[PDB]
Every structure is written in structure tokens, then in C-alpha cells.
Symmetry: D2
Subunit: 402 residues, 4 copies
Amino acid sequence: SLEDLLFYTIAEGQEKIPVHKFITALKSTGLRTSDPRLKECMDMLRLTLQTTSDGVMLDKDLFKKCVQSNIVLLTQAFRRKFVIPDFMSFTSHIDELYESAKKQSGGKVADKFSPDLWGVSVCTVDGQRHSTGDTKVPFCLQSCVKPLKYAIAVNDLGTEYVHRYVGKEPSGLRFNKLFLNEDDKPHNPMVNAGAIVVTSLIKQGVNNAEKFDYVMQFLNKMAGNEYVGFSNATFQSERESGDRNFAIGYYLKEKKCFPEGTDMVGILDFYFQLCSIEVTCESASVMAATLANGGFCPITGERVLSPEAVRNTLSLMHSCGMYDFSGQFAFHVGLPAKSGVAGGILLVVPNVMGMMCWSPPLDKMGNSVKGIHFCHDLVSLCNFHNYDNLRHFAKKLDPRRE
Amino acid sequence: PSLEDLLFYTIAEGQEKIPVHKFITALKSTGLRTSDPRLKECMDMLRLTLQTTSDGVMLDKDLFKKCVQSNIVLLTQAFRRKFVIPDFMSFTSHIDELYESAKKQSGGKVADKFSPDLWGVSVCTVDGQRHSTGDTKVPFCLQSCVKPLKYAIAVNDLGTEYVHRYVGKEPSGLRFNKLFLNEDDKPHNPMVNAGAIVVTSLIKQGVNNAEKFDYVMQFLNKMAGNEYVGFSNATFQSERESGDRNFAIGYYLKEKKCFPEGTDMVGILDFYFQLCSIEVTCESASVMAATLANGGFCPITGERVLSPEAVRNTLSLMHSCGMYDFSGQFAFHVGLPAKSGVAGGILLVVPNVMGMMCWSPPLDKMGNSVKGIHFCHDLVSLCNFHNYDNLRHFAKKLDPRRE
Amino acid sequence: PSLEDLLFYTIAEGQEKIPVHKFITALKSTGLRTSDPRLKECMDMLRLTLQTTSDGVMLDKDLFKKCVQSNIVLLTQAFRRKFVIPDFMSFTSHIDELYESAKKQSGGKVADKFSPDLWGVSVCTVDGQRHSTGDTKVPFCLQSCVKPLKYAIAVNDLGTEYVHRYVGKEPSGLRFNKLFLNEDDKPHNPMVNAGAIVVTSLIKQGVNNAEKFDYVMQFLNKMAGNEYVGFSNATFQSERESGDRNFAIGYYLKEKKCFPEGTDMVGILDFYFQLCSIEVTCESASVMAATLANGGFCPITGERVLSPEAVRNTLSLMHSCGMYDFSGQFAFHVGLPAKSGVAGGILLVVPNVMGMMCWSPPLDKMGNSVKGIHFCHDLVSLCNFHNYDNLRHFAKKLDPRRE
Amino acid sequence: SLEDLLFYTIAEGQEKIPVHKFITALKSTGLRTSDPRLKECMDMLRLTLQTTSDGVMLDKDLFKKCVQSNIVLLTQAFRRKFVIPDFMSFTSHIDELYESAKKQSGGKVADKFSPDLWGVSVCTVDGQRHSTGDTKVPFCLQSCVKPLKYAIAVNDLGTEYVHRYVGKEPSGLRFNKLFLNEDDKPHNPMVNAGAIVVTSLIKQGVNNAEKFDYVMQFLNKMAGNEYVGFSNATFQSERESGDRNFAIGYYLKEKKCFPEGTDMVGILDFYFQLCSIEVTCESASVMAATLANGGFCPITGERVLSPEAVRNTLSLMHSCGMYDFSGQFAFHVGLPAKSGVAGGILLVVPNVMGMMCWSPPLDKMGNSVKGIHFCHDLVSLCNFHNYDNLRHFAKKLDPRRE
Ligand SMILES: O=C(Cc1ccccc1)Nc1nnc(CCSCCc2nnc(NC(=O)Cc3ccccc3)s2)s1
Ligand SMILES: O=C(Cc1ccccc1)Nc1nnc(CCSCCc2nnc(NC(=O)Cc3ccccc3)s2)s1
């Protein structure tokens, strides 16, 4: 009697629960009715609300009928088994943390969005969503895709083959300039140099039209079929300006850094496409949550990413993610991130939640100000630093305990 | 309404009396050692109340309740399977298996007195559970393993802002492994000779090169729960006459005023050289490591040894800058804050779980003990400890925080 | 008062009529060639005279006089041994030995269509005196020998400091063999391909490539005294199907705004490849070399091809940034401003003496002709031509400028 | 008739030649009365200017027997066979060059002299001398001493031996702070790293009080026995602050770059000594002109340096002469030169002259501000630049043509 136990808990020992009393109780687990895992249960309460134009409260049988298929989720949500149990106040802090971070004036956009925008969207490894501010506005990943594509190539080619072509370390702050390492390979897949070679490994032999759908599919599964778009616009402008990536390409060609059969100039076309893929904070925190969640999309429970692919990517998101800010960043926030010149910080606090912070203004290394100050405050407030202690964490509050 | 009685029927499964060996081999399987200092009252009472018979004997709800009365809740948790590694027993067997497979790979050159066949591994967890195997009671110099330990002491005592005025926090790269300073005219991080030597000059800013040392030993004893920390004046003598590279760094960091006001660079070099020949065994350093793995509370004494500021920063930097030039490949393939050492040492830490120390004197080309490098890989291959595994979805790996 | 007569009676033994053929030998052992352009009128009038007179033929003082009237100024200098190398006959003996001594050095690898036993030295002194040994009339491309010439042409047309808004003037630094731009986002110097490409980018901006090229051909023709200067279309079309590295450099230059505004980098790359495919002979290129040996004036025409501001900058960077990595050891040991080329050319230049081209196609590992550097070493072994050789006290060296 | 032929030429048709007239005829030939190759003659000018009390005034036989033994030297001088025939005009050019450089007011002295000191001095392959400014003030060569010591090493050991221990190429502008090159040899004998090493090659097997004599023996033969001194003061301060040099010293020790059995700390003391050697501009011109003269001292006719050692030392000064300024220096100036932190610049125009400039204030690169201006102007005046032609040199001046 799983459904049975759940009814008594929500229905205050009386005749029944009314309609919104269920859903306001359901919207308090931070779950969202449009969760794909709740599709059935929501379908069927459309059916039973349509039994009368007068009511209706629900009997224990009427209740149990709808939540039949989804009580596994509804129990964990209502007996507060979700990775952040009091999700209700945990959002009231993120609210504050959005608010104080909204007060951060500085930063320059790339050069054409409005520097007013600012939207952070949580998505817990369990599905609990929260968002405040402008989380519905689509934007491009740009270099936020290098992890995602890097994932895809290790997901399909394995680590050994891939790093036969790209390094694994960071190169430091004086050689954010060099292309190849001592062995005539770019140093890691997070710098455009290694990214160009990675792009040259995704689906060799197939043509550039088929190649691109293969990652759009992949990029869709990672966001639980929430909004991933494409901007032809930033695509064409991203190759007309891509003189540096051409440079890299030609130098990769000369010293033979692509697989034997690569039409180098096409691979750059493909690279440039990949950067112009669109997302919203909402759709992109599910992508981050997928990395948070070992490779499984938190709101569809589908496997998208092999764990090697997801480990390797958070590993290099750590070392190599925030450009030259990586060192200081891996230090104070210590959360595998990936910045993007569009302003996206594809934050991940693994085994908890995925974030996407979007506010377009950047800093001198290429990281959203508000994006960066938000993590800082976040780590300050909650024991999320990769090497915080989960037990003796002193003045920090944990949202995984009660 | 009977917490001391609550634990009785777990071992005395509905039995009358219970042998104390039946209780302590039940407590060696908790992984704890009888010499756990937060058991002493339980172990003194039991030694005392073991002076109530001369043939045996054993204890009852009368006696037990009088003895584990003091430390009941640790024995509760210890016996309610409430330790971070519940079946510590089979986890040790894993370590044994990695240890011996990492023994047969006999490449390397000893640095330039030991036998290359030495190979010692020791674990301690944040709950105090310990294990080891091989030559783990053999004292070696911390050498560069001392560096994060000494960093920690500086941050606990001075805060993170202060200590990173004097030494950067990033890893150097496979190019600049020989430059001393980054462009900020600081050594890149506390893990390079350049950076250690600098951190050393921030401990006990004031008192003299004998109080500074005792004070590091005091800390180093607290942190190790009072296991063997020591000091091999023999190494220190040869460290300080063949130390031309270091004297180069010393003179260059003085050249670029990298120490603080009133720093006797040459004496700091002695302290450094001293701190390098500070002796530990794999065992005593397991408690060092697990202490940092434990928010700064010493797992086997319950004593707050370090800031949680201090443990975090150190583990932040052992990750990046820990394995000389192999740190990159290391952070990738094993992604555990480690720290290598010229005598064979690796100070491994699995945060929220355990601390480790490995040891085989033969270094490889890079200067990291062959068998030690081999062993840290294999352990991440095995267990989802790698800093970036998922705790829920981790493929074909074994998590030992689960039964 | 007695000018051509002064010469006329010196080649005669106070005698009757000197035969034309023994005047011919007297002027071939002066080293000049009967085809010197600065002599064409003397040979025109003397073959015309053989055409009319009969039947020896022989030569009166009046029959000698103003055949040589035109070029007597040279012709005296030739005969009173007032040339830079007075006893040129013996000096060719030493070239004939140094050629043969360098003939035995068959090591070295061609680039990848010729044959390695090809070996030719042609000497053009600043006066005109020619000597060749071995295969001098075989045509080869200039390849990166063009860089100094093209560089000269750039500064002769645009002047040092403009050219150097876009190109440094320093020799990169043996291990930084590989980075294109320096700190200021400038290439290092015009001898490196990264600078060649940007130099090329600055000659006759605005014109299109067909004209640019001919503007370069005429220039090269005069420097050679209108001896063979040509263009193999064969090597150019592969120079464009293989220069991936150059394309690398070009785009990176574009990204950093290293070309002038309104530079189509892809055609500047094509123009650049054409300058490498220009061909010459040992004979034709020793006149090019002697031109720079000659403050820019072509020894066998008398024609100012290059500003002295441009001879020097080119000779400078040929000293220091010239022979690629070997230029250090080369500036040390040979101290001559040379320039290597991957076709097998060393554009040797002994300022104030002569211009050589040596040609053996086989390159060494740094890409420089085996026999070329051997000849070059042996040549300064025997003679005080090394840059900082002393012209007065020079030990056992022979000086050819002293009789 | 050779002494008569001389006696007749310098005679103004006057039967009894004055000696005031003789010496100003001699001084203005460049030579000074203190020339050692003229002592015999100058001795007997003291002998016969002792016989009475008048002029005195020599004649066909008195003249003849004083210049009897120095005639062929006094021939070329008065037959204008001296490499710079009209040395006279040549010196006021050097004067203008000095005064033009007089106005370059920038610069910071290191830390003790007063920053208005400035001098130049010339000496030719034949002996003609000139100086202007503060050219009799002792100062330390400091770093100007590395070429001189290198010569002595090559002269005593030969090119082969010496360059088993120091390289021969230039450093490299950005990573100009490395001590060694990838052969573990210091880059060249002109960096403190290679200087220090060159210093251990001199007179192995003999203690440091005697090494220093033999160096000054050499450093005397080379300056024709003009002023060579030594400062213990600067030696004790250089001893007490060159932490960098200790660094480098220790670094060469661990890298085993000295010849076996080298007391590093002593060689550092010897280095600190050798850098504290005292010269004036004057004495240092004969230093340089000895090198300009194939190793024969212009003023004593002694062979001091085998041409080997002279060739090499003037090659390395060209390449590695002026610290990070050497690249641009060899380009624009293209005379082998050698800068010093005191302001010293030991310049050399082979086969014509040696020079030496002093000016305390340095630039941002460790080179005398005005000592630097001075060359740049000099080469802009004379076809001295190593690659100016001796026939066609555009609008420049040649001082070997009359
Ligand atoms: O933007 C600045 C300002 C700056 C300022 C201060 C300091 C430095 C720089 N400088 C820049 N300089 N170049 C840039 C473009 C990247 S370099 C071309 C890519 C590579 N070239 N050689 C490589 N090594 C190998 O390929 C190893 C190899 C091993 C064995 C055999 C062959 C090859 S990779 S940017
Ligand atoms: O061991 C090889 C063979 C090898 C092999 C391969 C390639 C070359 C050479 N060569 C050497 N290896 N170690 C050597 C002594 C190392 S220390 C040099 C003195 C400095 N220490 N930190 C510095 N940076 C800054 O003071 C600030 C700054 C940093 C960066 C930019 C601007 C400003 S400079 S030499």
C-alpha cells in the first residue's frame, strides 16, 4: 500500500485532499508537474478533473489512480528523500544568492546581448528545479560545448584513442599561447587547439551534415528534451572571425595532428557549428545535472554519457575549465566548471546538482562576473567546495542534512 | 532508555556473558585498534574489571555497562555499522591485492642507502579505522611529503589569505618545472622546493629554529594522534651539504625578497632541510593524511588539529601540484590529492573517507616511486574515490561507503 | 700623356707586334672573362680588327691603342695587378684545391630530384674576376636564399624602421626555433619564414602578384649582372601544395593583425612561394652574392642595385639570423654573412672581396650543404676572410689581397 | 738616408729643428710622448735636452741619432701610414659624439657615484690615442671584464678547450634568465653564468692570490702597462649582495659546469674580485685596441693575445655583448661591445681601434644611457659597422682613407 501510505500523509486525516492542495504540496518538493517522469500521473489527473465541472476532491481510490504509476518518485519527494530535502528554504537562499549576485555591476559582454540579463537555474541530480531571474532566454554554449563534445568523443572513442591526439594536462598561464605540447599534440580538449582535434574525431568518414545531427541528438538527450537550439547567426560569424582556429588547423595539418584522412577545413566548419548551439539556463542545468549525475539525465533517468566520459570531462573541467582562472578557481570554489564567452558557467556540484548560470558580462579571463561571484557565495554558504568536509564543515550550512 | 544495554545484544546476541576477545576481535573487525585513544577509558575499565577473575573471564550487562558506559556512542556508531567504510574488513583485502601487484613492478633507481624491495602502504579513515601491509613501520624522511603538512600548519595558524601572499596556488606546467618563480615573483605553489622553502619561513614567525621545530613536531604529533613522528639528523647532514640546487633557490628567493621581514634564509634552509628529514612511518603518516581527510579533526583522537580552511586548501593544492611533473597525468587518471617524496613516499588522501601513505625507495625517471605510482592508479581503477566519480552512477567500480 | 700606350708597351717585351691570342692569355690569367660586359666594346673592336687586317694577326701600338680605349681603365687595373686579388691565377689553384678538398665530403641529404655528386663553386670578386670549378652552369632554385635578397628589396623600397614595424631584428633563440611572434606580436626577423612571409607582405602593396613577381625578377636580374636568373614553375606549384606550415603562419599573422591593412594573406602566401622557386646558377648567383659583397653594386656591370642601408641590414641578419640554427656556430667560426637555402645553396659573401655561391644539393640535418659548410670552413682556414680575422697579424693564413 | 729623409721631411727648412715642434708634430700624429715604442728616442731627447739651457734644437745628426732606433715607427707616423692617417679630424668627431650623448639625461645609477660622470677613450691598432670627459676616474669594469678574461682563457688554452665549458651563441630575450642552455653549458662567456665559468678556467692549479696576479700580468700586457687597479670596497659589497651570483654559482656546482677541483665559493670571490678590477676609460682603450690589433698591443708592440683568442672574443661581444640589448645593438651598431653596470662599454672596431665608455646612469636594461647613445651615433658616422662596405658606404665617413 505505497499509494495508500502517501494519501494519508497529504490528506489531513479528513475527507480528502483538494486539487491544488495536492499540487502545492507537490510543488513544494521542488518537483515540477511537467517532469517527464511524472507524465502519466499528470495525464491522469487531467482525466479525473475532467469528470466534473464542479469539483473535485479525490477519494483514496481517485488519488491512488493517478499517482499509481509515479509513486516511487512521489514518495521520495514527499517523505523528503530528495538530495535537498528542505528544497523550500534552499531556494530562499539561492533567491538571496541570486539577489546579492544580481547587485554585481561589472563585466563586459562579447563583441550582442543585454547586460541586464541574469538567470540561474538549479537542477538537482534528483530533478528538483529552481530558477530565479531570466532563466528562459536562449544563448549559445560556445566553449561550454568543449566539455560536452569532449564527452561525446570519449563517449564514442575511448580515452586512449582520443588522447593519442590531445593531451590531458593544463599548460599553464604563460602557454595559453602555444598550440602543441612537446609531443606535437594540443595539451587538452578544453583549449581551442585540442577542441579542433576532438571535433576531428567525432564520426570520422561521415559528412558534416550528418555529423552535426549526431551531437544535436546527443545534446538533446542530455537535457531531457528541454530546449537546445542552434543559431545559424553566431555560426557564420564564428567562422568569418575564426582566423585563430584556422591558424591552429593549418598548423595541426602541417605537423599531422589530425587522423589520416581529415579534410581540415571542414573540421573547422564543424567546430564552428558546435559552438553556436543554443540553450537556456533551464535546459542547460539539466545538461550540467547530467554530469552531476554520473551521466544520467536527472529528469529523464536516461543514460546519456559513459562514466569515463563524464569523469574525464569533470577532471579536465577542473584542471582546464575556467581558462587561466582555472587555478584560482579550482582552488576557492573547487567545482568543475566550464566558462563560455557567451556568459555560461556550466557549473556542476557532483552528486548534488547541476547549474547553469547565465549573465552575459565576462571578465578579463572570459568568465561571467555574476556567474563567478555566484559560485563564490554559493561555496561560502554550502559545503560544496570539492574538498569541503561533509561532516566537520563549521559555519557552512549543508542542504543535504536536516 | 538503555543505550549501554542497547549495544549488549549486538555482540551478546541473546547470550548471557560475552568473552572480551569475542568483543575485541569484534572490535578489531570494526577496523579500530585497541590502542585507539578515545577508547582508553573503555580499555582501562576492561583491563581493571579483567582483574575480577584469574581463569578468564568475561563481562555481562552488569560489567560491560560499567565499562563502555563512558565511550558508548562511539561504540554505538562503531557497532551500528555507522562508520564511513562499514565493511572495512573486505576493503583492506582490496588494498592488500593492489599492494602486492604494485610490488612486482621493479623498475627504478634509488635516489642518491635503502633496499629497493621496500614497499609499505598504510590506511587510516576519518572514523579511525586502520589497515596496512608491507614495510609500513619503517621510518623514512618525509622529504617533500612534508610540504603539504607544513602548508596546513601555516594556514590553520595564519589563515588562507596570509599564506598565499607569500606562495602562489597553481601548478607550474610541464615546461616551467625548473623556473623558481611564477610571474608574480612567488614560487608557483607550496609543493615545489621554491614554495616549501617559502612556506617554512612563515611558521612561528618570531621564535628560534629549535622552538619552530618542536612546534612543528607538536602539531605533527597532534595530527598523527601521537604515533611516530621523528627526525633523522643523519639525512639532514647530507641534505645540507649536497643541497646546491636548494642553496640556489634559497639565494634566489632572498634575491627576490620572497620571505617575510626578518627571515634568516640560511637558517630557514636548515629548518627546511630539518623538516625534510622529519621521520615518519607509513603508519604515523596515515593519521596525518586521514586527519586532513577529516575536516581537521584527528580521527583517532577527536581533537580539532586544523582549521577546515586549512585542510581544504591543502587538498586543493595536493591535487594540482602534488606529483612533480606527473601531477597532471595523476590528477587525470587518479584525481586524488597525493604528494610524492624522494625517499619513496606518497601522502595520499581520499577526502571524507581515509588517508594513506605509500612507500618504495626506487624513484622512476620523474622522481615518484614506481610502485607507489602503480598503486594509486590501480586503486582508482578499483574504487570510486577519484575526485570526480559519481557516488550514485560509477559503472563497474566498487564503492566501500556502501554494504 | 701615354695612357693606352702605357698599357700597350707593358704587355709587349719592348717588341714588334704582340699577337692577339697572347694578349688573350694575358687577360684570361688576369682572371677576367672575355665576356665581361664592362669589356664588350674592347672585344667588338678587336674581333672587327682581325676581320679586316691580315693575316696573323699582330698588333701595332696604334692597332692596340683604341681597341682597349673603351675599357682601359679596367684593363690597366687588371694588368698592373691592381685588383682585389692581385695574383688571381694562383688563388684559383687554392680554390681548385678547396673545391677538391670539399669534393670528398659526400655526406648530407637532399631535400624532398637532382644528384648529390653535383658540386660547384663560382667566385665573383668585387672587381669582376671570375673563377669556376665543377658544375657551375647547372640551374637550381634559390628557396630561402631569397629571403635576404627579398628582404633587401623590401628595405631598399621601404627603409629599415617601417619594415621593422612588422618584423623584429633579433635571432629568435635556438630552442624558440618554433614560435612565430615575439612579445610585441611581431615576427622575430626576416630570415625566419614567419618574417619572410611578412616581408613579402610589404613589397609593392597594392599591385597584384603577377607584377609584384616581375618587379622581383628584374631586381634579381640586375644583381646577377643579367646572367641566368630564372623561375622554375615546377618547384612553385609543389611549394604551394606543401606549405601547410606557411599557411599556419599566415592565418596566425592575420589573427594578430600582423600584415598591413588590406592584405589578402592567401595571395601573399602564393607570392611568397614564387620567390622561393626563382632559379640561378652557381655562376649567376656569385654575381648576386658579390653584389652584396660590393655595397650593392654589381661587380660585372657597375650598377647600384641595392641601397647601402639595405646591404647592411641584409648582411647583418645574414650573419646572426642566417644559417638557421647553425648561424651561431657559423657566426663564430666562419664569421661570414652567409645564407642557406634548401636547394643546396650557401650564398656566401666575403664583404669587400667576393661573392660566392656554393652548390651541393645535399643538406645536413640543420639543412645546409655539406660541401658548402666544408668549403666555407676550409676557406677561412686558409684565408683571413673571417669577419674578425685580423688584416695585419693573422698567423699562418694566406691573404690573397697581398702579393 | 732614412733618418735624414725623416730629418728633412719634418724640418720646416730650418737647419736646427726645435723639439717643441717635434713633439707636437709627434703628439698630433696620435701618439703620446709616453708611447713605449718611442722610449729610446724619448730617452735621448732627455739626454741632449740636458746639455745646456735654451730650446733645445736638434739637427741632421742629433735628430738622426735619437730617432736612429725608432725611425721606421716615426716613419709611418709621419708618412701617414697609420691606420687612421688624419687622426686629428677623427678625434673632434669623437668629441661631438660625446657631447651629443652628453644630453641624454635619463637613467638610474645602481646601489654609488654621481650621475654626471661620462667619458670616452680611443686607441688604434697603431697606437693613436684619444679621450674626452671623466676618463681618468677609476671604476670597475664589473661586467666589461668577461671578454678580457675569456681572451686570456682562449689564449692560454685554445678555442677547443675553453668551449668545452661555455657555449658560444646568444641568449634569448624572454628566457634570458635561465642559467644554462640545453647542453648544460652557460649560454656564452658574457652572461654571469658563463663569466663565472670562464673564470675557473684561468690558471687552474694555483691559488686565488696568484691567479689574480697572472690576470693582472695579462691585464697589464694588454693595456701596455697603463692603469689597472682594484677596489676592495666594491669587492666587499659585491661579496655581500650578489645573492643572484651565489644562486648561479650553486647552480653551476650542482650542474658540474666548472673544471674538476674548483672551489666554487673562491671562484665566486675571484669573480667578485675580477668584477671589482679597476680601470679608467684610458687604460681600457688599450685593452680594446689590443683586441682590435690581432692581439699585439698597439703601444708596446708586444704580442699579448694569439689571434685565435682575439677572433673569438670579438665574435662573442658582437652576439652577446649588451645583455638583452645585444640583438638590437649588433643590428644597429654592429661593433663587438661589452656593457657594464658601472656604465662601462668596452667597444672595438677591428683593424682600426679600441674604445671604452663610462657613464654611471643605466637604462632599464643595465646599459649606460649615454654610453649607449654614443655608439649608435658613432656607427651612424663611420663605416665602422661590421658590414658597411669599404668602397660604397653612402653618406658615411671612413677614417682609413685620406
Ligand atoms: O603571443 C605571443 C606573445 C608572448 C609573450 C611572452 C612570452 C611568450 C609569448 N607569442 C606567441 N608565439 N607563437 C604563438 C602561436 C603558437 S606557436 C606555433 C605552435 C607551435 N610552434 N612550436 C611548437 N612546438 C612543437 O611543435 C614541438 C616539436 C618537437 C619536436 C619536433 C618538432 C616540434 S608548437 S603565440
Ligand atoms: O635545465 C636547463 C636545460 C634546458 C632544457 C630545456 C630548455 C631550456 C633549458 N636549463 C635551466 N634550468 N634551470 C635553470 C635555472 C632555472 S631559474 C632561472 C632564473 C629564474 N627563476 N624564476 C624566474 N622567473 C621570474 O623571475 C619572473 C618571470 C617569469 C616568467 C616571465 C617573466 C618573469 S627566472 S636553467
